[PDB]
Amino acid sequence: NIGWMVSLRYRNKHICGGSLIKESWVLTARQCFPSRDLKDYEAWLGIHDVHGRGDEKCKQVLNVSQLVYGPEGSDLVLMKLARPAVLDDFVSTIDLPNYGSTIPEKTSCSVYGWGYTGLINYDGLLRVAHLYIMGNEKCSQHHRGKVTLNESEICAGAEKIGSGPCEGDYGGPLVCEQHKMRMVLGVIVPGRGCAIPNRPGIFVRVAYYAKWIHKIILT
């Protein structure tokens, strides 16, 4: 069940994915905000289709009251929705990992989004790529020694070779099952190429910022 998927709309057009971590809070990326005029932003919950087609008894559309930006390092942003999202069968939250935590290598993960698919006639339906956790050291090498990772970054290699997130996928989550429970472990951010075979993807370590996240979201 994908209740935590959020579609960020900037000027009535989908710009980014996001994740409902608490009723009035959405965790997304700084890249998702071309303007400081909150007027142009809307968050859609209950949707499966990008244009919100078959979703109308589910679809929840909320205005954005606040933009709390994460530490200088992180390209994270916390969105306060103008009214709480109603948690029904179609809309739900996603759990966060604890501050002092890590996930084993080769743990299975998923990236979700309405982003670019390289397909001709894309139907606008929510997509999913299957990924597996990778060590930061083995991931730095796999990138041809061009990029070195901080403790704030997380690596995930693709299960189906040519797969991975792209333009329109940013802000979306990297969901893995930590202790039999779905948790947001990473935030999709721009990379160094969309879905390169054998090259893994860098996400941002949500656990690294869980202290800050809980500081904001817990009023």
Binding site: I2, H48, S108, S110, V111, Y112, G113, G115, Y116, T117, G118, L125, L126, R127, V128, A129, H130, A158, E159, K160, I161, G162, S163, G164, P165, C166, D169, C194, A195
Partner: peptide
């Protein structure tokens, strides 16, 4: 998502 399956597809059938 380049090379992904639709949301309703299980992990094991990709």
């Amino acid at each position: 998502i380049i090379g992904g399956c639709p949301y309703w597809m299980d992990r094991e059938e990709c």
